[PDB]
Subunit: 169 residues, 2 copies
Amino acid sequence: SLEKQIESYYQEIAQLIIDMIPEEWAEVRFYAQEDHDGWKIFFFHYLSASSDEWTKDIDIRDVIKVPQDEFMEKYNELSFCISDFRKDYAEAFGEPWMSFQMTFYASGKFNIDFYYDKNPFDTFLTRLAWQYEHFGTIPDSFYKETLNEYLEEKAQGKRYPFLEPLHHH
Amino acid sequence: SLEKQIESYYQEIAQLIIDMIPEEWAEVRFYAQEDHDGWKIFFFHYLSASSDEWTKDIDIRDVIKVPQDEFMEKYNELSFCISDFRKDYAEAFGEPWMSFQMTFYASGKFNIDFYYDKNPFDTFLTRLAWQYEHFGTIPDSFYKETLNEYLEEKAQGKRYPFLEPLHHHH
C-alpha cells in the first residue's frame, strides 16, 4: 500500500538517524527541506534517555567515538534518502513536498507531516526558529538577535507551520 | 561552449570549498565520487599558507568561529553541486563519471581528471587510502589495520588511479 511505502521511508530515515545517535534516546524530531532547485536544509534533535535533555545532531561530533568519516557516511546516506524520497513522492503524488517533519519515539510510535511552503530562512536561523517553536528555546546575544529576525516576521502575523510542532489562567 | 560550461562547475565547486576554508591557503585537493545508486563520498584537504601543513575538511569544524550550521550549509551546497554536475554531465555526454579529482591553487590554476571505475572501499578507508597515495601517510593501530585492507590489494598489483595524485631519477 502507499501507507506501507511511507512507513518504509520513515524506517530507513529513522535507522540512519539512530545510527548517528551515540547513546540511548527517548524521542527524535527530524526536519527536512528541499526545494525545486535542490536547496536543502535538514537536521534532527534527540532526547537523551540518560540526561533527559534534547541534543542537537551537530553536537554529536563533540562526543563521537567512531571516526568522523563513519558519521559523515551516514549523514550523506540520510541526505540522499531525503532527495530520493522527494523524487518518488513527486512522481506518485504529482508534486513534491517542500519540507517534512518527523517525530519518532522509543515506543516505535511515529508521526510524519508534509508541507508545501517556501522557507525564507537560512540553515542557522531555521534551526533557531524550529527550536523556538518546538521547545520554547530563546537561545548568546548574537544568536538571540538572529532569532529576532524570525520573531519579527511572526509578530507581523506571518506563520511557518513547517517548523511548528503538532484553559487555565 | 561545453568547455566554458564545465569550467563553470569547477569554479562553483572551488568557491564552495573556499567558503569552508577558515584561513589563507595555498592549494586544495578535492575528491568526489557518486555511483549509479546515489552512493556518495567526497572530501577535500587544503594546504595552509602559514603553517605549510595539510588540513582535512572534517577538522575545520574544530576551529570555525561561525555557527556550525553555516558550515553544514556550505557542505550541503557542495554535496548538491556534485550530484547536479554528475546528472548534467550524464545527460550531455551520455554516461556519468564515477568519480573525479581536482587540484587548485591560490593563483586560480587547476588540474582535474575524471574516472569511471567502481570504488570498493567505504568512506573511512577511501580517505585513509587517498592520504596514503597523496601524502604517504600511515596512521593509531585500528586506523593502521584499516589501511592494511587497501595495502593488501596493492600488494597483489591492484591500482586505484581515482585516488592517486594527478621519470628515472633516484
